[PDB]
Ligand binder design. Sequence first.
Ligand SMILES: Nc1n[nH]c2ccc(Br)cc12
Length: 293
Amino acid sequence: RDPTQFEERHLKFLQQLGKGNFGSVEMCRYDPLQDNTGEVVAVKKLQHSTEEHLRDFEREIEILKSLQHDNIVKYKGVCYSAGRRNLKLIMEYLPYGSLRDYLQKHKERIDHIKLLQYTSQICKGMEYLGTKRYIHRDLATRNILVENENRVKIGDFGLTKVLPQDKEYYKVKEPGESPIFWYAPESLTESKFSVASDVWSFGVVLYELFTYIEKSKSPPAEFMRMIGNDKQGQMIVFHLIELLKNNGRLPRPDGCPDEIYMIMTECWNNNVNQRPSFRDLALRVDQIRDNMA
Ligand SMILES: Nc1n[nH]c2ccc(Br)cc12
């Protein structure tokens, strides 16, 4: 029998874990003996399993399956439905949930040493991803999962794209729901996504971590304040682009160490080529951890 081949009939629903963009994730027990002793897994499925969505979902599955790293959620297998060929992605279940909820829950009880451990781990997952020429496009604390107190993993790849052989960016022609408050200026203006725009988003993740997910301090709350809460729909994007062009930025989180703040601000460079590399960020973060320890 194939362990990566899961029969949907044996999957028992336990609880809902999240909904992002097109897919929904559920906690399920794979219980073929039907006695509640089987493994608990996370199961991602599509809410609207159209032709086009299914095609994109299958590419996402191949992306995750190709990744093997301590800080990337583990692929376990796939479910296939008879007939129209609906797909479910089976992944390891990480019991402490999303980093966003985890931090929002425990707040400052998670100290700076711990936050920088998570930062380094996120950096390393992204650096590895980049070696495969994948662009995440959706790096945010809501897409990072907590395995235990000492380890986080990048947990969703629903927007992930593979770079063309000959280009260092991927251009999205018809944008869907976009996390614009995590987007680099060139992603907003030209829909260009690259390792460097992932670095920009990583700076926003660093901001998220050091604000402890204080709601009034979220990137959407802060950017909306800066452009004016009166701005709506497409005008938000127009004014955000103008703000960023004029070096409008998220503020330093209260109590943030200057060395960490410096990293955020370097990630948020309008000049794409001047943003740091994930290889260098991992080294820099680990050095800061070493100095603190
Ligand atoms: N809690 C989780 N464990 N594993 C997951 C995979 C994807 C998503 Br979304 C959540 C989880």
